[PDB]
Amino acid sequence: EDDLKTDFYKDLTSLGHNENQQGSFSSQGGSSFSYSSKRSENINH
Structure with missing residues (x-):
């Protein structure tokens, strides 16, 4: 048996005010x- 389960999550949430x-x-x-x-x-x- 050779299970290889992998996951990646990235969030970038940028806010800017003028x-x-x-x-x-x-x-x-x-x-x-x-x-x-x-x-x-x-x-x-």
């Missing part, structure tokens, strides 16, 4: 008054 975000916000308020006055504003978020 995530990239940019946000830009800007506000530039202002006001003018003729007495005289001036206002200026800037925002860069």
Whole structure:
């Protein structure tokens, strides 16, 4: 008798994630008054 039973199992299960975000916000308020006055504003978020 010469039984030779053999088995091989291989699993490769790879997962990958890609995530990239940019946000830009800007506000530039202002006001003018003729007495005289001036206002200026800037925002860069």
